[PDB]
């Protein structure tokens, strides 16, 4: 049966072929396809009060 | 498969795919490079997809935000936006991985019954999913009017159809 | 002189007068101002590649 | 001057100050238009990403040579540094509005900034426009005249607060010109 932990796969994609790297060292090797990385983790989808309040205020505007 | 581990462990541990592993991933799935862009068309727009869909669900039926409505109160609205994002992310992962098994198993199995027990309105859910489906289609095809994605010119109609089919799986499961 | 740490005050406002609370216990006294809280911390403003790529692609649309 | 947040600003280490109850009562009686001021601050912080992206995008759309070779935001690295700065500046302005003074904005953010931009060849005209667009956008959000994304508040007038916010942007403008 489905999970009930409000967790979903969070996909992050990285294309740093322009050579601009982030502060953290590589976590996989990009030998053969420099600059490209796919990251996946399971993260809880947190409640976001600001977004909920904005829909309540703004739903009538496209 | 490297993803399967972190999905199963469901503990925030991340799987990083690069180099020959990435070349391989892209071989296992059709249209590898285009597919990554189609995923990015979703993940780079995730908040807007979710907010536009729930907002549209409400503007078409404002009873949803009136007393006794499905998203009356910030708590309920937030829970609904959460669910929309949860669904969207399992769809995006289905597009990344090329199948709906995780979507079906971890997200959809028992979902209709959950909503039925809570009194969550079926029509509103169906419309939110429908708007997300339409919006994702626009972003994948790069026809969205405000926020586009730069990619080499070409045809992603097959990927767009596949994404739509994942949304149809959500719709079928809740029907 | 100016700092060069790329940090700025991050202000977070909480108005939970509708009674919906977050997972963490109160971190201040609420006596007299029910449901309200002002939080300030200094945080690094991170570079955001996705937003940079979007401006390059989308600047010509309002 | 309000000294509630000075410790967390000085430590600059991610530690947070939480102001509520009696401490919030005090703050809101200290600065002027206390509750309206909190809403005016929210009008900025709840729209921070939009304010920044709209301003930098307007700077470019009015002068697209800025993203072409030799342009101030040519390359993703430069564009991202510019978006970062716009957000840094906006947040020091938002803190000025929260605290009721511009001391931290001037001391920690602006002092030496003109000279830094000069050494790097950051274009002054583009910078002035980005600041100008942020100023106008913040004014619209404070007054709740923005056309797409509004904020629900009790009916009233925040013109004094809007002017004050404008004044903080003017400090940025003064410092960079
Ligand atoms: C974050 C939003 C978007 C950006 C940025 C962008 O460039 N495109 C964006 C969104 C988008 N929406 C749609 C389709 C729909 N959105 C709807 C909700 C909207 N309509 C309303 O009447 C109200 C309430 C006033 C809303 C909040 C609706 C109903 C649709 C159509 C759904 C359908 O076809 O059944 C698309 C796809 C079409 C397009 O490109 O315009 C995008 C990309
Ligand atoms: C997130 C953006 C906004 C939402 C959502 C909303 O409801 N309002 C939003 C922004 C906003 N912008 C402005 C004023 C300006 N924005 C500008 C940049 C824009 N104009 C362009 O030509 C291009 C490139 C094609 C852009 C990206 C500019 C130039 C202005 C005017 C600045 C000036 O007056 O000198 C406002 C304030 C005015 C209004 O309410 O419409 C808001 C709220
Ligand atoms: C230069 C300042 C540009 C920029 C870069 C930037 N990247 C990140 C974060 C990450 N970058 C990667 C990329 C890789 N990791 C690898 O192991 C490999 C080889 C396979 C690549 C290509 C990854 C994985 C991350 C996240 C790391 C993690 O999970 O902890 C940042 C930090 C912000 C972020 O996390 O996205 C930055 C600043 N950003 C820009 O704006 C410049 C254009
Ligand atoms: C439909 C989605 C739109 C579209 C896509 C399209 N993309 C390409 C080519 C490439 N896309 C990438 C991007 C990635 N590869 C990765 O592994 C990852 C994860 C980090 C990403 C983001 C790459 C590397 C290429 C190859 C070219 C390059 O070096 O940039 C094409 C070209 C056709 C092909 O199959 O290669 C197309 C058509 N194009 C559209 O017009 C659609 C709206
Ligand atoms: C109910 C689920 C709604 C909701 C709530 C929500 N709140 C937070 C986080 C915080 N809430 C506060 C509020 C206070 N703390 C206090 O001590 C007092 C009295 C003075 C108040 C009013 C604070 C300080 C936080 C942050 C705590 C921290 O700094 O660690 C969350 C977590 C997310 C966040 O940090 O913003 C949530 C989910 N969210 C919704 O969507 C519902 C409408
Ligand atoms: C200009 C900004 C817009 C505007 C503002 C406005 N606000 C109020 C009244 C209140 N606002 C708050 C909000 C807070 N107090 C806090 O401590 C915090 C931090 C968490 C917030 C967000 C409160 C508590 C009030 C008091 C009234 C109430 O309890 O609802 C007014 C009313 C006049 C006054 O000074 O109280 C106004 C005018 N209103 C507009 O129309 C401007 C667009
Ligand atoms: C938004 C489009 C609609 C809506 C949503 C809504 N959902 C709930 C409650 C739940 N939603 C889920 C769903 C999941 N949990 C998971 O862990 C996963 C997979 C990882 C999914 C898909 C669950 C389990 C619940 C119940 C437990 C919980 O609240 O978290 C609510 C709250 C209903 C209530 O009365 O309490 C709402 C509002 N509601 C609508 O009206 C929209 C059509
Ligand atoms: C965007 C509107 C404009 C723009 C910006 C731009 N800025 C830089 C570089 C720097 N910006 C700062 C600013 C600060 N650092 C801080 O720590 C603080 C206070 C906390 C501020 C205000 C600094 C110190 C630098 C230099 C060091 C660094 O890169 O971080 C760049 C990069 C310029 C380059 O050539 O490397 C850019 C692009 N550029 C424009 O064209 C817009 C007008």
The rounded distance, in Å, linking the Cα atoms of B8 and D3 is 49
Mutate to test the pocket of ligand 1, among B144, B148, B150 (most ligand atoms within 8 A of CB): B144
The rounded distance, in Å, linking the Cα atoms of D174 and D56 is 19
Tell me, yes or no, if D81 comes closer than 8 A to chain C by beta carbon: yes
For the range D120-127, what are the long-range contacts, defined as Cβ-Cβ under 8 Å and sequence gap of 24 or more? D121/D72, D122/D72, D123/D66, D123/D72, D124/D176, D124/D177, D125/D63, D126/D59, D126/D63, D126/D66, D126/D72, D126/D73, D127/D176
The rounded distance, in Å, linking the Cα atoms of B148 and B132 is 16
Give A23→chain D minimum CA distance, Å.
13
Pick the ligand that lies closest to the CA of residue C52: 3
Helix (H, G, I), strand (E, B) or coil at B98: coil
Token pair of B93 as six digits:
């992962």
Residues near D116 by beta carbon (within 8 Å), at least 6 away in sequence:
C2, D122
Q: Where are the beta strands (DSSP E) in A1-62?
A: 7-15, 36-44
The rounded distance, in Å, linking the Cα atoms of A43 and A9 is 6
Q: CB C5 to CB D12 under 8 A?
A: yes
Q: Domain residue spans in chain A?
A: 1-62
Rg (chain C; Cα; Å): 18
Q: Chain A residues with CB inside 8 Å of C20's CB?
A: 49
Residue D128 near residue D173, CB atoms below 8 Å: yes
- Compare all CA atoms of chain C with the CA of A13 and give the residue at the minimum distance: C50
Token pair of C4 as six digits:
């060069």
For A1-62, CATH number out of 3.40.30.10, 1.10.10.10, 3.90.510.10, 3.40.250.10 equals: 3.90.510.10
Residues near C51 by beta carbon (within 8 Å), at least 6 away in sequence:
D49, D53, D80, D83
The residue nearest atom 23 of ligand 4, judged by CA position, is B33
The domain that holds B39 is classified in CATH as 1.10.490.20
Question: Per residue, what are the HEC states of B2-51?
Answer: HHHHHHHHCCCCEEEECHHHHHHHHHHCCCHHHHHHHHHHHHCCHHHHHH
For this experimental structure, what is the resolution in angstroms?
1.7
For ligand 8, is residue D52 a contact (CB within 6 Å)?
A: no
The rounded distance, in Å, linking the Cα atoms of B93 and A13 is 12
Q: How many domains does chain B have?
A: 1
- Through-space distance between the first and last CA atoms of chain C, rounded to whole angstroms: 37
Task: Please report the atom of ligand 5 found closest to the CA of residue D24.
Answer: 20
CA-to-CA separations, C59 to B102, D49, D138, in angstroms, rounded: 37, 15, 19
Residue D97 near residue D40, CB atoms below 8 Å: yes
Where residue D21 falls (left for φ over 0; alpha for ψ -120 to 50; beta otherwise) is left
Tell me, yes or no, if B44 comes closer than 8 A to chain C by beta carbon: yes
Tell me, yes or no, if B114 comes closer than 8 A to chain A by beta carbon: yes
The rounded distance, in Å, linking the Cα atoms of B26 and B44 is 20
Residues near D100 by beta carbon (within 8 Å), at least 6 away in sequence:
D1, D2, D30, D31, D32, D37
Q: Which residue has the tokens 């799986």?
A: B169
Q: Which helix (H) or strand (E) holds B118?
A: helix B111-118
Give residue D101's domain range.
1-177
């Amino acid at each position: 049966k489905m999970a009930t932990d409000s967790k979903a796969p969070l996909i992050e994609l990285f294309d740093e072929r322009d050579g601009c790297k982030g502060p953290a060292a590589n976590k996989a090797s990009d030998v053969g396809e420099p600059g490209l990385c796919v990251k996946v983790s399971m993260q809880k989808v947190a409640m976001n009060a600001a977004a909920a309040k904005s829909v309540a205020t703004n739903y009538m505007r496209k | 498969d490297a993803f399967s581990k972190v999905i199963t462990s469901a503990d925030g541990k991340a799987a990083y795919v690069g180099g020959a592993d990435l070349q391989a991933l892209k071989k296992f799935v059709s249209d590898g490079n285009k597919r990554m862009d189609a995923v990015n068309a979703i993940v780079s727009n995730a908040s807007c997809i979710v907010s536009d869909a729930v907002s549209g669900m409400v503007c078409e039926n404002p009873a949803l935000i009136a007393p006794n409505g499905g998203v009356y109160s910030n708590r309920k609205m937030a829970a609904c936006l959460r669910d929309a994002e949860i669904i969207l992310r399992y769809v995006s992962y289905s597009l990344l991985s090329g199948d709906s098994s995780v979507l079906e198993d971890r997200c959809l199995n028992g979902l209709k019954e959950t909503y039925a027990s809570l009194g969550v309105p079926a029509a509103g859910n169906a419309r939110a999913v429908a708007i997300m489906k339409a919006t994702v289609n626009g972003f994948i095809n790069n026809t969205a009017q405000q926020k586009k994605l730069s990619t080499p010119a070409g045809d992603c109609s097959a990927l767009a159809s596949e994404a739509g089919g994942y949304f149809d799986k959500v719709s079928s499961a809740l029907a």
